[PDB]
């Protein structure tokens, strides 16, 4: 009653996801339907840990979908997001697009940095980064992070449970089911890199993420091949921190979002 209901935008893992309109002052957003018996882990009275965690993050402005609110009905809980519009999701903007240019490839992963250690500085790890979980606002060339329903706190110590994606899981957990969580985060953006650069992710099988050999099926420069390369480090112990990401030359002279949808968009 306090939102007009439109059209289903998707539905998955993740549960259900309708457009609508917030009745009160036609503010655009998303509404979230998550069935209670398909929910794994819970937080604090007892919600959703992807509610904890969106409000952990959705203070201020940043690269994160805002919860503007959130609901709980006998057999599920609702959640009202923000919902930009224009938009396009990353993986949909790629499959139409191809792989992309560095420049702009440099912009949208820059912005996705900025969101993922916004996330970590508010105590949250999202542990499904990838393209389907990152929305394009396509006037202001703006990105922003979604589906928080895999995710966790962060925490210092080792992770023993992932039900994220898989081929943009590290080594370490296809193998030893162990990983920590920034390191295991640095691989995931290794494969969003490579994802955005070359079209396509890099690995398929669980050997191939093993293997950890990156072959290159576009043309991609030296160094923007080597920060892919670094991310994908075997050893967790040898992955970049996002500092050292964000120092790498590829990583330099960076567009603002509005030069980038102005140029790309
Ligand atoms: O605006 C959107 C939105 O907020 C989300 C969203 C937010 C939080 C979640 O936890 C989640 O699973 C999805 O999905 C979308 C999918 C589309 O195709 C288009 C959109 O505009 C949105």
Partial sequence: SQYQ????????????????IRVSDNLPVAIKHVEKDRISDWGE???????????????????????????????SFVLILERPEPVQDLFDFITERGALQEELARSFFWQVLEAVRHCHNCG??????????????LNRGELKLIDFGSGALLKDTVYTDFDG?????????????????????????????????????????????????????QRVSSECQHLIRWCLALRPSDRPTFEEIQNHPWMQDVLLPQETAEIHL
């Fill in 45 to 75: 009275t007892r919600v959703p840990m992807e509610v904890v965690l969106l409000k952990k993050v959705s203070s201020g402005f940043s690269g994160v979908i805002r919860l503007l609110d959130w609901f709980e009905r006998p057999d």
């Fill in 165 to 217: 994606t898989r081929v943009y899981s590290p080594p370490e957990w296809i193998r030893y089911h162990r990983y920590h969580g920034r390191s295991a985060a640095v691989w995931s953006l290794g494969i969003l890199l490579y994802d955005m650069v070359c079209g396509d992710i890099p690995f398929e099988h669980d050997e191939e993420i093993i293997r950890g050999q990156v072959f290159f099926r």
């Fill in 5 to 20: 209901v439109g059209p289903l935008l998707g539905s998955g893992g993740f549960g259900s996801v309708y457009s609508g």
């Fill in 124 to 137: 949250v790890l999202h542990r499904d980064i990838k393209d389907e979980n990152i929305l394009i606002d």
